[PDB]
Amino acid sequence: RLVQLSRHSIAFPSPEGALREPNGLLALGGDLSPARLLMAYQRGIFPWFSPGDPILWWSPDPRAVLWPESLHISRSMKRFHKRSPYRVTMNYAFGQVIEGCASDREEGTWITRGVVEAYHRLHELGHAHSIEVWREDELVGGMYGVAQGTLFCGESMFSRMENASKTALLVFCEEFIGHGGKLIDCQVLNDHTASLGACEIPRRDYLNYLNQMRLGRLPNNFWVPRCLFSPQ
Ligand SMILES: COc1ccc(C[C@H](N)C(=O)N[C@H]2[C@@H](O)[C@H](n3cnc4c(N(C)C)ncnc43)O[C@@H]2CO)cc1
């Protein structure tokens, strides 16, 4: 049971054979090369592990997910946004966002130099993207993830100013839906993400969605770096 990946192949074991507790633990080892990483997202698997541990790959059951249209926005958040003090941009500073998440210290601590360089390559190659939230000239939050057709896999987010990451997601969902976005993978569910409207569906359901959506498509220029929302 369980399995060590080899530097030779880039193949992964079927997600369904993953462990029950720790939920999702499927395999360890391998590397974080673009090819293997990309392969993992294709198969509905993601790497996650603390510093000093060998690479760990997961595919939990259920799976956290967020339907873009079901994003919950408090009435005070709408009030806030209507007169928002933030500027949201896309792919303006991926390196700064991932670094921001990597400092969140509650658990951005798993984002080691190696993981950071790993998703940097995916960003250069055009698979990973980031949404930045600015307060005047300072980056006060954001989120990044691996795009996959009409599905988007959230990796992490951070906030240095009140409601920052909320608007990051708010603005993202609008843009996302408006252009054919269909689902947001939230990996593992937690309090913040759950209050935002995230929910859990069966691993096999998420996997199906994955297969139907990875084939989808968004405008050929959806991810080019641009501003999505400007303050007043
Ligand atoms: C569309 O825009 C976005 C962008 C980013 C996200 C990240 C989302 N907060 C999220 O998945 N937040 C999660 C994950 O990034 C990551 N994580 C993932 N798996 C685990 C795990 N195990 C499998 C044991 N243990 C601990 N942490 C894990 O930790 C965070 C909270 O615990 C969501 C949407």
Distances (CA, A) of 59 to 13, 16, 150, 188: 11, 8, 20, 9
Q: What's the domain count of the chain?
A: 2
CA angle 119, 187, 9 (to 5 degrees): 55
**Same domain membership, residue 137 and residue 97:** yes
| Owning domain of residue 29 | 1-60
How far is 99 from 93, CA to CA, in rounded Å? 10
Ligand 1, atom 32, residue with closest C-alpha: 190
Ligand 1 atom nearest the C-alpha of 192 is 9
Pocket test for ligand 1, best of 187, 200, 206, 213 (most atoms within 8 A of CB): 187
202 phi-psi bin (left φ>0, alpha ψ -120 to 50, beta other): beta
**Same domain membership, residue 25 and residue 69:** no
User: Please, are residues 4 and 27 in contact by the beta-carbon 8 Å criterion?
Assistant: yes
User: Please, are residues 184 and 68 in contact by the beta-carbon 8 Å criterion?
Assistant: yes
How far does residue 41's CA lie from ligand 1's centre (Å)?
Answer: 14
Ligand 1, atom 12, residue with closest C-alpha: 156
Angle between helix axes 113-124 and 94-101 (nearest 10 degrees) is 150
**Same domain membership, residue 129 and residue 54:** no
Ligand 1, atom 3, residue with closest C-alpha: 154
How far is 206 from 223, CA to CA, in rounded Å? 24
How far is 109 from 121, CA to CA, in rounded Å? 20
Q: Given in angstroms, what resolution was this structure solved at? A: 2.8
- With the C-alpha atoms ordered 53, 198, 33, 223, is the resulting torsion angle positive or negative? negative
How far does residue 64's CA lie from ligand 1's centre (Å)?
Answer: 9
Angle between helix axes 75-82 and 164-178 (nearest 10 degrees) is 80
**Same domain membership, residue 88 and residue 8:** no
- Give the CATH number, domain containing residue 80: 3.40.630.70
Pocket around ligand 1 at a 6 A CB cut-off: 22, 24, 48, 58, 60, 107, 143, 145, 152, 154-157, 169, 172, 184, 186-188, 190, 193
Decide: residue 157, CB within 10 A, 0-12 exposed, 13-18 middle, 19+ buried. Answer: buried
User: Please, are residues 5 and 58 in contact by the beta-carbon 8 Å criterion?
Assistant: no
**Same domain membership, residue 74 and residue 7:** no
**Same domain membership, residue 232 and residue 143:** yes
Pick from 105, 184, 106: nearest CA to 152: 184
User: Please, are residues 13 and 26 in contact by the beta-carbon 8 Å criterion?
Assistant: yes
**Same domain membership, residue 12 and residue 104:** no
Ligand 1 atom nearest the C-alpha of 186 is 11
**Same domain membership, residue 71 and residue 106:** yes
Matching residue, tokens 């959806």: 222
**Same domain membership, residue 228 and residue 163:** yes
- Give the CATH number, domain containing residue 40: 3.30.70.3550
Pocket test for ligand 1, best of 155, 159, 179, 191 (most atoms within 8 A of CB): 155
The method recorded for this entry reads X-ray
Length of the chain, please? 232
How far is 156 from 127, CA to CA, in rounded Å? 15
How far does residue 165's CA lie from ligand 1's centre (Å)?
Answer: 14
User: Can you spell out the DSSP letters for the chain?
Assistant: --EEE-SS------GGG--TTTTTEEEEES---HHHHHHHHHTT-EE---TTSPPEEE--SSEEEE-GGG----HHHHHHHHT---EEEESS-HHHHHHHHTT--SS-TT--HHHHHHHHHHHHTTSEEEEEEEETTEEEEEEEEEEETTEEEEEEEEESSTTHHHHHHHHHHHHHHHTT--EEEEES--HHHHHTT-EEE-HHHHHHHHHHHTT----TTTTSSEEEE---
Pocket test for ligand 1, best of 19, 20, 48 (most atoms within 8 A of CB): 48
How far is 218 from 182, CA to CA, in rounded Å? 10
Ligand 1 atom nearest the C-alpha of 187 is 11
Ligand 1, atom 18, residue with closest C-alpha: 188
**Same domain membership, residue 100 and residue 3:** no
Instruction: Count the alpha carbons within 13 Å of 64 in the hemisphere toward its beta carbon.
Output: 19
How far is 32 from 120, CA to CA, in rounded Å? 11
**Same domain membership, residue 216 and residue 153:** yes
Matching residue, tokens 């993953």: 18
User: Please, are residues 168 and 88 in contact by the beta-carbon 8 Å criterion?
Assistant: yes
User: Please, are residues 148 and 210 in contact by the beta-carbon 8 Å criterion?
Assistant: yes
